[PDB]
Assembly symmetry: C3
Homo-oligomer: 209 residues x 3
């Protein structure tokens, strides 16, 4: 029915497959710390899966009215990003043994970043959508700012490159500028999410970090 | 007005009475740890009380449309379950001195379980309600999976038997199959909640755990 | 358009200015603990800023119907209070090195307090609004109940006097009794918020606590 349904079904299946591979490999962990990284890495695609399923089936999509049109917004992404992004940041934070001040700041910065994105996504006044997009980007640069060693650096670097693509997709997407159709927007985000999560997941859990 | 109002008023009063008994008995605690268990055990019926009051009075109930009918759904239960279930799991987790990996996994598993229940409760497509019910049940079996010693075992066992009744109520309830009228569904859930919370509460706080 | 817009623009700017002053002064912190207090103190006006911006522009305001009228409610305040109040309580809690039982209880008490305020704010049955206001006040007295030493005492005392003004504003405001117009209500709350946050912020971060 919806042309981006295939990307949605394809994200759901891939988040589904990542959760499981990780649940199974996670059996044989006595290490308190590896338990921490295994819990986080698996939870991320797990919550991700559920939200991809929500979007795939009509739940997780609304028509936000702006520009003289009702616009299809997939709100369910922010409900996923709300929990997964702080946890990915928790893997990195934990990985390099960061302090409370930093992890909290990182996680707090994360909250407002995804928190302003939702508002930008839901704002009925076209112009303002971009004001909120801006506050979100600034929170991101703060996180990228604040952001064993070898595997951390490779992960810190994967994070940086992948996350920075999100605001651009939002900006050019059907969410911002409206030049990129929802299709490829759902496709691009599906590629970002399975990498930032499953790719990130593998790199990490497969490592000796 | 609503026939299950009595169960709602009866749940509110009982959650009300459990919160208080616990607040008062909680006075005389110097123990850092007993403080932890006292804070959790009291918070649970406390948040519970507020949500029973919300449902009792019209707030906390919506008409979800499916099956060619508008259906009365008590969304307020998921707003309560969202916070109380992870805390009950926190009593057990803390009780047996579980690791970060486990408690997080438990709490993360909990979130999606109640998180998928809400979506199942709110899904307008009858068929899908059960797809989400299924993902929720699987998260539960994961928790029951992962799930001093004497009092833990009695508590672990109370949890297991009580929580497993919830999906069945949802499934046969006015939320799922629609064979059990809302009345007895509100009644059964009122009995599950006052046990999983007040009963659990007593067993625990009354113990030497 | 809205007469309280100036208070909203004036709160946004002031929360904006507090966040920044704190972000900049927060550069030169090697102390794990000062990092904790710097992360919290800055996050508070930061989340505050975003919610003042939300209210300033139409997002963050709804017409709740009661009394035979549709009433302008600024729901966005509860979305801010939800996160900032537990963090202000975290500064104090951390400041005096409180236990897990206490901080959790404090934070849990906080949640229901702001959590009942939102419901009171959203209740369509005029009479009930006050029932929920009451449960919220009781949670507050519980927090004020539970509530280096010199700077803690000055902060504990600032908290107490400022927070106690909130329920009265709500009660006499356009949210409760409806005797105080939204204008001065937005003005009074703007003064409470910039003090409880920026004032509190300065007192604390400027100190040797
Ligand atoms: C698994 C998903 C991840 C890591 C998602 C990350 C999303 C972002 C970093 C989004 C950022 C945005 C902005 C900076 C501006 C507003 C729009 C957003 C939410 C797309
Ligand atoms: C105090 C309340 C407690 C402990 C409530 C527990 C509720 C559950 C374990 C619910 C489980 C459900 C499913 C497994 C499937 C979807 C429907 C639910 C939410 C009833
Ligand atoms: C930065 C904001 C702060 C510290 C806000 C605090 C707000 C309160 C303490 C509000 C309390 C309320 C009641 C006790 C009853 C219901 C209405 C409220 C939410 C205004």
């Amino acid at each position: 029915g919806r042309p981006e349904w295939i990307w949605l079904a394809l994200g759901t299946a891939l988040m589904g497959l990542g959760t499981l591979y990780f649940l199974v490999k996670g059996m044989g962990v006595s290490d308190p710390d590896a338990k921490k990284f295994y819990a986080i890495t698996t939870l991320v695609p797990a919550i991700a899966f559920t939200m991809y399923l929500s979007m795939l089936l009509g739940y997780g999509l609304t028509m936000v009215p702006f520009g003289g049109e009702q616009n299809p917004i997939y709100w369910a992404r922010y409900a996923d990003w709300l929990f997964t992004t702080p946890l990915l940041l928790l893997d990195l934070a934990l990985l390099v043994d960061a302090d409370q001040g930093t992890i909290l700041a990182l996680v707090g910065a994360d909250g407002i970043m995804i928190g302003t994105g939702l508002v930008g996504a839901l704002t009925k006044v076209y112009s303002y959508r971009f004001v909120w997009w801006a506050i979100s980007t600034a929170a991101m640069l703060y996180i990228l700012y604040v952001l064993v060693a070898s595997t951390f650096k490779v992960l810190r670097n994967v994070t940086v490159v992948l996350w920075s693509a999100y605001p651009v997709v939002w900006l050019i997407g059907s969410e911002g500028a409206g030049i990129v159709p929802l299709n490829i927007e759902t496709l691009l985000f599906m590629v970002l999410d399975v990498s930032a999560k499953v790719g990130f997941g593998l790199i990490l859990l497969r490592s000796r970090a």
